[PDB]
């Protein structure tokens, strides 16, 4: 979900 | 008897204790925006024309009714200070990243859930129209697996509640994330019709083409409406009432669950959508008008000035009641600068949905749903 860090 | 439907009487469930639950450094899921929420819903004085109830802390046998005894034990047992001895099992069940692990976090799952159940067997006790739980609507939970900043799917228990008494429920989900855990809950069955409008391509959860409609007898149960960046509110009021109808004909159930994802809002911090708060109430409107055993629940919004905003005028539509543009005084009106207004606008991207692709995905899904 977060575009911020991560996948999701 | 006669009639059809006036006024309907409204049930509130929250908990003073789930403002102060913290996700994490720099994390965007704040359950602080629920108590902004309602301390906003009580300086309207929208508390004297609605019954406000405190949601028990689900237990996990209610939990374990759709999820499985591995994943509810290991939430119950996993606490920041013991991280590393269940670093094994962390991974197993998604917990780490996106799910982080922190202070009461079993706690904030029983509140959530709690406020689900609570409200479905209020309606299936016939002592209200809506139920009302905006620490609700975590649809990304899986039966043993956590997702998308979803433990529990308070969800699917709520509506595994409410086939004790309703042969056919029906899911609505707003948020700009696709429902893929209340989908897959009821992929394979009829009693439950799972309908979702999303983003979709490289967009989270992956999920949600609408060429997803079902397996088993819930063929066809299934609708999905992907969509693009920046959709504003024409073109969602132009696709949400005939499909929703439509929905409502050839179906026909009996209790209506619409979850009230505030992250399709315009300038949200994860989304990519332009509604305003009109326009996302609207789709309140439309369910509501069936008068229907809904049961209203929370879910996204990243932008917790504009969530406050969201699911206090929702509130208000569920009670017919108008409410000035005008924000009174609460102990967060510093969030909400530097407007201090209820309503927001609309921002200057370009709707990526042309009407030309919203009336194809609409006629497309129109022959999935004459298939009942
Ligand atoms: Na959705
Ligand atoms: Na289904
Ligand atoms: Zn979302």
Request: hydrophobic share 35%; charged share 25%; aromatic share 12%.
């Amino acid at each position: 979900x977060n575009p911020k860090q991560x996948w999701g | 008897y006669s009639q059809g439907g006036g006024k309907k009487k409204v049930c509130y469930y929250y908990d003073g204790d789930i403002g102060n639950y913290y996700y994490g450094q720099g994390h965007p899921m704040k359950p602080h925006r629920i108590r902004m929420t309602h301390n906003l819903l009580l300086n309207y004085g929208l508390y004297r024309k609605m019954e406000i109830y405190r949601p028990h802390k689900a237990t996990a046998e209610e939990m374990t009714k759709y999820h499985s005894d591995e994943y509810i034990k290991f939430l119950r047992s996993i606490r920041p200070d013991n991280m590393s001895e269940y670093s094994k099992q962390m991974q197993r069940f998604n917990v780490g990243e996106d799910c982080p692990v922190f202070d009461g976090l079993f706690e904030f799952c029983q509140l959530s859930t709690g406020g689900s159940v609570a409200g479905a067997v209020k309606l299936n006790r016939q002592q209200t129209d809506m139920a009302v739980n905006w620490a609700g609507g975590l649809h990304h939970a899986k039966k043993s697996e956590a997702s998308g900043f979803c433990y529990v799917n308070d969800i699917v228990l709520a509506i595994l509640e409410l086939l004790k008494y309703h042969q056919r429920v029906l899911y609505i989900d707003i948020d700009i994330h696709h429902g893929d855990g209340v989908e897959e809950a009821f992929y394979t069955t009829d009693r439950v019709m799972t309908v979702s409008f999303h983003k979709y391509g490289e967009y989270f959860p992956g999920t949600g083409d609408l060429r997803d409609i079902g397996a088993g007898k819930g063929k066809y149960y299934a609708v999905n409406f992907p969509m693009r960046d920046g959709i504003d509110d024409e073109s969602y009021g132009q696709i949400f009432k005939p499909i929703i109808s439509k929905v409502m004909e050839m179906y026909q159930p009996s209790a209506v669950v619409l979850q009230c994802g505030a992250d399709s809002l315009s300038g949200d911090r994860l989304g990519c959508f332009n509604l305003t708060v009109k326009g996302h109430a609207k789709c309140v409107e439309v369910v509501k008008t069936f008068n229907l055993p809904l049961l209203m629940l929370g879910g996204g919004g990243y932008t917790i000035r504009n969530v406050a905003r969201c699911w206090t005028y929702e509130t208000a539509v569920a009670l017919d009641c108008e409410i000035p543009n005008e924000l009174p005084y609460n102990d967060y009106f510093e969030y909400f600068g530097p407007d201090f207004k209820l309503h927001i606008s609309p921002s200057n991207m370009t709707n990526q949905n042309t009407p030309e692709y919203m009336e194809k995905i609409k006629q497309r899904l129109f022959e999935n749903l004459r298939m009942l």
